[PDB]
Structure formats: structure tokens, C-alpha cells
Amino acid sequence: RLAMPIRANWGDVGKVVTIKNDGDDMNYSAFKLGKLALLGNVKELLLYRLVDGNQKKGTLTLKDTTENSAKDVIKLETKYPTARNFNVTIKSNLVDSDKKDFIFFENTKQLFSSSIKGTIDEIVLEINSNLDNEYVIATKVADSDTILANVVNQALEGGNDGCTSITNESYLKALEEFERYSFDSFVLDGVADEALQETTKAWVAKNKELGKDILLFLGGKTEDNIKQINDKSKSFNDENIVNVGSSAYYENIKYTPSEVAVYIAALSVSKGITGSICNAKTIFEEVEPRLSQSEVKECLKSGTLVLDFDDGDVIIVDDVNTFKKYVDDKNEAMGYISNIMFINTINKDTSLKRKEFVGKIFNDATGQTTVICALKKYFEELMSQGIISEFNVDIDTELQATAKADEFYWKWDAVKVDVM
Amino acid sequence: EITKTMKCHVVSKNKDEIVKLLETLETSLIIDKRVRLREDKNMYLTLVSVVEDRESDMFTTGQLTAVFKMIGKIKREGPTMDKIYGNGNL
Amino acid sequence: IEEASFLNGSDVVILIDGVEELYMEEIKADFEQDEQSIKLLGCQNEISRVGTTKGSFSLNGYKTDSKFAKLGFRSFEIIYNLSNSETLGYESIRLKNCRLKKLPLINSKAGEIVKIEVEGSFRGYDLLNE
Amino acid sequence: IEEASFLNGSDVVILIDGVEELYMEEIKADFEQDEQSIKLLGCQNEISRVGTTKGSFSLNGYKTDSKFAKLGFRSFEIIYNLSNSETLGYESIRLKNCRLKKLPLINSKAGEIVKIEVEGSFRGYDLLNE
């Protein structure tokens, strides 16, 4: 489960939708950065579309010809709103007059062509159900079995581009929509604008206060030097925030650090608790600027997730997060993405456990023993799985000393396997 | 467990009436082996043994002796765990 | 001191083979298993598994007729209704394919009431109610 | 409160080998059967079968003659009439081919009455009445 605010001309506007293992162009983030999410072997991707406020759906209305006076019976509009030149042509069939060929176009290439014998409902069904018409929805205007009027190359008009303008509120609407649901990570769709990154930081802090520790992944701009990359990575110092440092090449596009953070998110989510990207090779063909040992150390110290061409392929140098500019009380393992994801999953399972004990139990020694034994059972099962080497889960006497009657506090502390 | 030995008298001018009343009272106690403590039906006295000593004095002692017991649960409406929170480290 | 209740054992109602039984005063029934203890190398504590189950039951009561001697070793069902009176939640259990281990043909002492004792084995049970 | 009745064990009349025995105090007799429990190869509950039956009995009473010591291990029949008097439905049982397990020659303590104890085994029974 990965969140995606694709700055795309394609995608559903104002709603979060999921995509299985199944846009296309590179100007649209549905494939320019949707591919970065898809190629990391994530189980499921959930997407949202960023669009300027002024943007709607192109449409096209059609009228009959069997009667001498033409009357509207069919209407056509894009599957999702856009101003793209989705042309359509409707010619008379060669053999049967009652039949007509319904030819569709993306810009000029024939997207679809088929023939139906004039029934409005069946024509709409063919235009909707068939796979080539993923770009378009046909709708009925009237209930009359009659043949349309001949047209050619009709552009569905009355909309605007999805990439009309990347503005602050335009970005923030996606986060406001993502509030209602929970995701493994969020990646901001590669915009290096600092205001968007800071708004995302505040938003994720708010969600963390709700227990929704979604993983934020970020990066600087291409114009950021190692100095500026480190400055922007140090500006964030949250465990759920990561700032990728270097640009990366996969096929043709120079990807900004924030953009390649999409694929870093894909790897992090798809790996699971066991796998780590501390030294994982990446599909990207090249990365720049190159980092020496000193540059790598300075970047990692500044919370930057570093990618470099240290071998035959691009390799992530470490699993660090923005918290890697850490403090004394919390160790360095707290500054690693896999460990933080593991901790958030623990907090989620413990959320399930607390709502399993929803106050039907008394807040006495017996209820305390019951709850702490349930948590001990769960962590012991994790130990048997080998995820945990050692854990200690006990009452939170600091809070339980001052905890009121209706509230109860506990804590856990567990160690995990290392991977050099 | 609360056990009470409750003795019952039956006074009457006609002694055979005493015998009849004690007989029907004993039979009712045995057949209806327990008695509603209150009309809420929550509690119930359950009989243990009913015994009649007809020689015993009609006024000072009383004839019928019945032993009733009842079990009660220690009420404890303590506080609840309405809120159960925890944190994590390594 | 909110109310509680013990299930007095005189609420039992035993139906042996579809006809109610009036004179039984004690009934026992258990569903034994075979432990199947297993040692594993590198694991000091033994491990148990269910094994195969095996029912057994027993009955005591006053002799009122020769029902059991006539029954022989035929398969027969037993139903056991333990009613509760403070609350009406009777616990009903059915024993399937009971079979006497021995016919108590004669068991009688000169001075005492003639009591009958029975025990056998039942293939399975159905917990009808609770 | 409608009538019931218990069969007091002093109504027993025991005929050992056709001659009435009148000093017995208690009599026991059961019809054991080997269970022959079978554990099927796929089903997880045991199954029992009737197997082979084997009678066993026992009596105690006051010594009045050397009837049993003189009887030896000969086969002999035992009848057992448990009369009910509230209603006249006596329960009568016959035991076929009884054989003493041990011949009780002497059993006598100084200060007490000389009681005789007997135990044995019988091949089969006939439920003459009920």
C-alpha cells in the first residue's frame, strides 16, 4: 500500500483508487513516477491525481439520423477529466446501413474501432466494456433505437490539463484526501518545492499524533549541492521522513532526489520487515553527483538517503532517515527505515490489541496481567519467527504512577537482527 | 456462603390443624426446593434439610426446623481500562 | 453482593434411550484422550497431542425394574438435562452410542435398598445446549 | 403425591442348585464383556465391540452347614427372586453353570459369627421374569 499524488493528466480527480499488478505518457506522473512505484514489486498501489482547481471533463454529444429531425441519443466523455485531444470518428458501415463504425483516437492513433447495429444501449455497452476504451466513457442521452449522424475526429472539449499548475493547495488536497485512509508510505510525487515538503512534514506530524505513522519519503532538487542536499535533509528530523540525496537515471529522464524517492518507497514497502535497503542494488542506470566516503558519511549524518554508483549498478548506501541527525537517548538503529517501519507495525498491532481490550477488563492487577501477557504472547510469537532476538515488555510505571483510573500505560523494548 | 437454621412454629387451637399445616408446609418446601428471596428473582434460598419435631413446644421452641443456604458473589465494580496506550524503543 | 448460584445436583433429568429415567441418583461421564507424549531432540520439554478419544460413563441409582439387564450390550443414547433455577439456562448433553460394560444382573444386600450400578463407554457426545 | 417404591434387599430368595438358600446376606452377579477396543486407521475416536462375555458372581452369608465346601467345583444353577410387594412384579434371574472360584473351607474369627463368603463364575443367565 503506497500513496501517490501523481501530477498527471490521467487519473481519477478527487478520489483515491487502487491499481493491481497490471496513464502511459512521460509528461504525466501516472507513468513517469507511477512506474517507479510499480517496478519495486509493491503488492498494491493506491493513487491520487493532482490537478489545478480549474479543470473539468471533456465531453461530446451525438444525435440520431433515422428520423428526418436529429435528436440527441448518445453522449461521450473521457473516463477521467482532461483537455487532451481524444478524437472520435463515427462513419457509416460499408455493408449494413443500420450499422456504423465507432472509431476512437488518443490524439491521432486509432485507439479502437468496432461496429454495432444502431442500438443505443448496446453501442454504449461496447464503448464502455471493451478494454481499448479505458480512456473514455460513453453515456446515453435518449431511449431511441436510431443511427447517429456521421462525424469524424471529434475532440472531447470542456476540460483542462492535469498538469495545469503545481500549486500549494493543489498539492495539499491530496494529503487531505489521504487523511481518511492508512498507507505504508507517502512520497509527495517528486516535487522539490520546499513549501510542499514542509507542509507534508506538518501533515505527517499531525497524522502521527493520530497514530498514523505513514512513511514520508522526500528529496532535494537537482540544483541542490551535497551542501544543500544535506541542509534540506537536516531541516527534517522526523523518523517517518527521508530525504533522498542524489539524482538517478533509469531510462531517459534525470530524476530529482524526490522523484527517485518513489522507487525507494517501492523497495521499502515491498521488502517487508525482513528485507532492508541498506545496501540494495537499484534499477537506475546512473546516479549523480558521485559521493566519496566523506561525502557519503556527511550525507548520511545529515539524514540524507544516499545513492551512488559504488559497483556495477546503482546501490543505496544505507537505510537512513531524517532522524539520523539523532540524539543521545535514541540509538542509531532508530534512524533506519526498516526498523522504524517495524516499530510502526508494532504500534499498529498494539492499536489492535488495545481495542481488543476496550475497557470491559478492569484496571486492576488482574487486567494488567492479562494485557501484558497478551503483549508478551505476541512478542514471543515474533521471537519464534526470528524477527526479535530479545524483548522486554512491562508496565509503564512512569505514566502508570500518574495514570488515572480509566487509562493504562505499558511499554516494549525489542532488539532486531543486523545486516552489514 | 450464608447458611441459616430457621425454625418455624405453627400455632392453632386444633392440633390436627397444626399437623396438616406442618405437613403441607414441609411438602411445599421439599417440592419447591427453593424460595424467592425477593420479587426481583435475583436471589434464591435453596433448602438443605427440613425436619419436624412434633413433641417440641408450640410457642417457645417451634416444631419445624429448616436449614437454608445461599451463595453470594463479592461485588467489585472497579475501574476499567478505557484507554490502553504504549510506546516503543530498541 | 450480587447473586450467584450453584447447580444443585438434584436438577438432573436423565433420558436413557428416549424414555425418562426417574431413579438414577448419580451420573458420571468423561471424554478421555490418549496423551501421545513425544520427545524431540534439542527440546527438553515433552510435547502432547490429542491422540484418539474414548468415552466412558457411570450411573448409580435405585433398582425399580430390569431395564438395564434387558438392555444387554445394545447401543443406546443418553441425554442429561442439568437445569438451573436462578436462571433458566439448562445445560443439556447427549451421549452417542453408549454401551454397557457389564450387565448388573444381581446386586443386593439383605438390609439395604437394592441399588443398581452401571458403567460403559460411549463413542461420542453432542453438547445440545449450555 | 403419587406412589413409588424401592426394592428392599431383604425380599431376595436364592435357590442354589434347586434347594432354597435362606442364610445368605448379599448376592452380586455381573455379566462382564471384553471391550475389544479398536482404533480405526482414519477415524480419530475409538470404537468398541461386544467381544466375549464372562459371568462372575459372589455371595456372603452366615454359615449353617457345609453345603459349599461339599459342593466342590461342580457346576450348579442359581435362581434369584427379588420380589416387590408394593406391586407384585418380582424380578427373577437364573444363572447357568455357576462354578466356585475358591472353596471356602474355613473362615472364622474367635469373637464373631462364622460367615461364609463365595465367589465364582457363570457361563450364562436366563432372565426368567422381570
- Backbone φ and ψ of D6, nearest 5°: -110, 140
Cα distances from A228 to residues A290, A298, A303, A306, B78, in angstroms, run 15, 12, 12, 14, 58
Q: How many CA atoms lie within 13 A of B45 on its CB side?
A: 18
Identify which of A330, A358, A326 has the alpha carbon closest to the alpha carbon of residue A343: A330
Cell numbers representing residue A83 in the block = 483537455
Paired strand residues for D96: D124
Paired strand residues for A100: A92, A116
Residue A385's Cβ-count burial label (10 Å; 0-12, 13-18, 19+) is: exposed
For A211, left (φ over 0), alpha (ψ -120 to 50), or beta? left
Pick among D6, D25, D90 to test the C interface (most C CBs inside 10 A): D6
Q: Are B72 and B2 within 8 A, CB to CB?
A: yes
**Technique that determined the structure:** cryo-EM
**CB-based contacts of A309, cutoff 8 Å, min separation 6:** A286, A287, A290, A315
The DSSP code for A354 is H
- Judging contacts by C-beta atoms under 8 Å, the chain D residues touching residue C111 are 9-10
- Judging contacts by C-beta atoms under 8 Å, the chain C residues touching residue D48 are 99, 121, 123
Paired strand residues for D15: D20, D79
- In the block, cell 537482527 appears at A417
Q: Are D114 and D23 within 8 A, CB to CB?
A: no
Q: Are A157 and A59 within 8 A, CB to CB?
A: yes
The distance of D118 to chain C (nearest Cα, Å) reads: 14
Pick among D28, D36, D46 to test the C interface (most C CBs inside 10 A): D46
Indicate yes or no: CB of B46 within 8 angstroms of CB of C8.
Answer: yes
- In the block, cell 442439568 appears at C82
Touching chains A and D? (3+ Cβ pairs < 8 A): no
Length of chain A: 420
The 10 Å CB-count burial string (b at 16+, else e) for C86-121 is beeebebbbbebbbbbbbbbbbbbeeeebbbebebb
- Could you tell me how far CA A177 lies from the centroid of its own chain? 12
The DSSP code for A14 is T
Could you give the CA distance from residue A17 to residue A12 in angstroms, rounded to a whole number? 7
The distance of B53 to chain C (nearest Cα, Å) reads: 26
Cell numbers representing residue C112 in the block = 439395604
In chain A, which residue's Cα lies nearest the Cα of B85?
A: A409
Strands A2-6 and A45-49 turn out to be parallel
Compute the Cα dihedral for A171, A175, A177, A178 and give only its sign: positive
Strands C38-40 and C115-126 turn out to be unpaired
Indicate yes or no: CB of A406 within 8 angstroms of CB of B81.
Answer: yes
- In the block, cell 424460595 appears at B35
Indicate yes or no: CB of C52 within 8 angstroms of CB of D39.
Answer: yes
Could you give the CA distance from residue A266 to residue A286 in angstroms, rounded to a whole number? 18
Amino acid letter, A136: V
Could you give the CA distance from residue D130 to residue D125 in angstroms, rounded to a whole number? 13
Cell numbers representing residue C34 in the block = 490418549
Could you give the CA distance from residue B16 to residue C26 in angstroms, rounded to a whole number? 39
In chain A, which residue's Cα lies nearest the Cα of B76?
A: A362
Could you give the CA distance from residue C112 to residue D9 in angstroms, rounded to a whole number? 6
Q: Chain C contact for D93, CB < 8 A?
A: yes
**CB-based contacts of A420, cutoff 8 Å, min separation 6:** none
**CB-based contacts of D11, cutoff 8 Å, min separation 6:** D82, D83, D84, D85
Cα distances from A338 to residues A180, A219, A416, B80, in angstroms, run 25, 18, 10, 36
Q: Chain D contact for C85, CB < 8 A?
A: no
- Backbone φ and ψ of D55, nearest 5°: -80, 155
Could you give the CA distance from residue A157 to residue A151 in angstroms, rounded to a whole number? 15
In chain A, which residue's Cα lies nearest the Cα of B80?
A: A362
Q: How far apart are the first and last CA of chain C?
A: 25
Cell numbers representing residue C122 in the block = 460411549
| Nearest neighbour of C114 by CB, restricted to D7, D24, D31 | D7
DSSP character string of A144-179: ----B--B-----BS---TTS---HHHHHHHHHHHT
Indicate yes or no: CB of B74 within 8 angstroms of CB of C1.
Answer: yes
Instruction: Annotate chain B with three-state secondary structure.
Output: CEEEEEEECCCCCCHHHHHHHHHHHHHHHHHCCEEECCCCCCCEEEEEEEEECCCCCCCCCCCEEEEEEECECCCCCCCECCEEEEECCC
Cα distances from A119 to residues A97, A123, A134, in angstroms, run 13, 6, 21
What Rg, from alpha-carbon coordinates, does chain A have?
A: 27
Q: How far apart are the first and last CA of chain B?
A: 52
Indicate yes or no: CB of B81 within 8 angstroms of CB of A347.
Answer: no
Indicate yes or no: CB of D12 within 8 angstroms of CB of C111.
Answer: no
Indicate yes or no: CB of B79 within 8 angstroms of CB of A396.
Answer: no
Q: Are C10 and B34 within 8 A, CB to CB?
A: no
- Report which secondary-structure segment, H or E, holds A37: helix A34-38
Indicate yes or no: CB of C86 within 8 angstroms of CB of B75.
Answer: no
**CB-based contacts of C113, cutoff 8 Å, min separation 6:** C62, D6, D7, D8, D9
Q: Are A87 and A107 within 8 A, CB to CB?
A: yes
**CB-based contacts of B7, cutoff 8 Å, min separation 6:** B61, B62, B64, B65, B66
**CB-based contacts of A101, cutoff 8 Å, min separation 6:** A89, A90, A91, A92, A93, A113, A114, A115
Q: Chain C contact for D35, CB < 8 A?
A: yes
Indicate yes or no: CB of B79 within 8 angstroms of CB of A364.
Answer: yes
Paired strand residues for A49: A6, A13
Q: Chain A contact for B84, CB < 8 A?
A: yes
Residue A363's Cβ-count burial label (10 Å; 0-12, 13-18, 19+) is: buried
Pick among C86, C87, C88 to test the B interface (most B CBs inside 10 A): C86
| Nearest neighbour of C1 by CB, restricted to B34, B41, B72 | B72
The distance of B76 to chain A (nearest Cα, Å) reads: 10
Beta strands in chain D (DSSP E): 12-16, 19-21, 24-33, 53-62, 76-82, 91-100, 115-121, 124-126
| Nearest neighbour of D130 by CB, restricted to C66, C113, C123 | C66
What Rg, from alpha-carbon coordinates, does chain C have?
A: 19
- Report which secondary-structure segment, H or E, holds A355: helix A337-356
Q: Are C57 and C95 within 8 A, CB to CB?
A: yes
Length of chain D: 130
DSSP character string of A194-232: HHHHHHHHHHHHHHHHTT---EEEEE--TT--HHHHHHH
Q: Chain C contact for B69, CB < 8 A?
A: no
Identify which of A273, A383, A363, A339 has the alpha carbon closest to the alpha carbon of residue B85: A363
Could you give the CA distance from residue A220 to residue B40 in angstroms, rounded to a whole number? 74
- Could you tell me how far CA D35 lies from the centroid of its own chain? 21
**CB-based contacts of A313, cutoff 8 Å, min separation 6:** A281, A282
Q: Are C61 and C116 within 8 A, CB to CB?
A: yes
- In the block, cell 494529503 appears at A175
Q: Are C9 and B46 within 8 A, CB to CB?
A: no
| Nearest neighbour of B72 by CB, restricted to C3, C8, C85 | C3
Q: Are A86 and A58 within 8 A, CB to CB?
A: yes
The distance of B3 to chain C (nearest Cα, Å) reads: 14
How many CB atoms are located within 10 Å of the residue C130 CB?
9
Cell numbers representing residue A219 in the block = 528529496
Which SS3 state, helix, strand or coil, does residue C109 take? strand
Indicate yes or no: CB of A364 within 8 angstroms of CB of B78.
Answer: yes
Cell numbers representing residue C67 in the block = 431395564
The 10 Å CB-count burial string (b at 16+, else e) for C19-57 is eebebbeebebeeeeeeeeeeeeeeeeeeeeeebebbeb
Cα distances from A358 to residues A353, A397, B77, C4, in angstroms, run 9, 20, 16, 26
Cell numbers representing residue A166 in the block = 503545481
Cell numbers representing residue D31 in the block = 455379566
The alpha carbon torsion through A10, A14, A15, A17 (nearest 10 deg) reads 10
Compute the Cα dihedral for A71, A77, A83, A85 and give only its sign: negative
Cα distances from A217 to residues A74, A175, B15, in angstroms, run 46, 14, 100
Which SS3 state, helix, strand or coil, does residue A371 take? helix
Q: Are A325 and A256 within 8 A, CB to CB?
A: no
Amino acid letter, A148: L
Q: Are A214 and A206 within 8 A, CB to CB?
A: no
| Nearest neighbour of B86 by CB, restricted to A339, A363, A411 | A411
Q: Are B46 and B34 within 8 A, CB to CB?
A: yes
In chain C, which residue's Cα lies nearest the Cα of D4?
A: C64
Q: Give Dmax (Cα) for chain A.
A: 88
Indicate yes or no: CB of C5 within 8 angstroms of CB of B72.
Answer: no
The DSSP code for A6 is E
- Backbone φ and ψ of D20, nearest 5°: -65, 135
DSSP character string of A253-275: PEEPHHHHHHHHHHHHHHHTTT-
- Judging contacts by C-beta atoms under 8 Å, the chain D residues touching residue C101 are 32-33, 35
- Judging contacts by C-beta atoms under 8 Å, the chain A residues touching residue B76 are 362
Q: Are D39 and C124 within 8 A, CB to CB?
A: no
For D72, left (φ over 0), alpha (ψ -120 to 50), or beta? left
The 10 Å CB-count burial string (b at 16+, else e) for D93-115 is bbbeebbbeeeeeeeeeeeeeee
Q: Chain A contact for B88, CB < 8 A?
A: yes
- Chains in contact with A, where contact requires at least 3 CB pairs less than 8 Å apart: B
The distance of A237 to chain B (nearest Cα, Å) reads: 17
**CB-based contacts of A326, cutoff 8 Å, min separation 6:** A332, A334, A335
CA angle D61–D66–D71, rounded 5-degree value: 100
Pick among D45, D54, D117, D126 to test the C interface (most C CBs inside 10 A): D45
- Judging contacts by C-beta atoms under 8 Å, the chain B residues touching residue A333 are 90
Cell numbers representing residue A189 in the block = 510525487
Could you give the CA distance from residue D71 to residue D82 in angstroms, rounded to a whole number? 25
Q: Are D35 and C101 within 8 A, CB to CB?
A: yes
- Report which secondary-structure segment, H or E, holds A243: strand A241-244
CA angle A71–A73–A76, rounded 5-degree value: 125
The distance of C104 to chain D (nearest Cα, Å) reads: 5
The distance of D110 to chain C (nearest Cα, Å) reads: 24
- Sheet of A88-92: strands edge to edge? A88-92, A100-105, A110-116
Q: Chain B contact for C88, CB < 8 A?
A: no
Cell numbers representing residue D110 in the block = 474367635
Amino acid letter, B47: L
- In the block, cell 463515427 appears at A90
Cα distances from A50 to residues A54, A83, A134, in angstroms, run 12, 15, 20
- Could you tell me how far CA D49 lies from the centroid of its own chain? 24
Q: Are C125 and C94 within 8 A, CB to CB?
A: yes
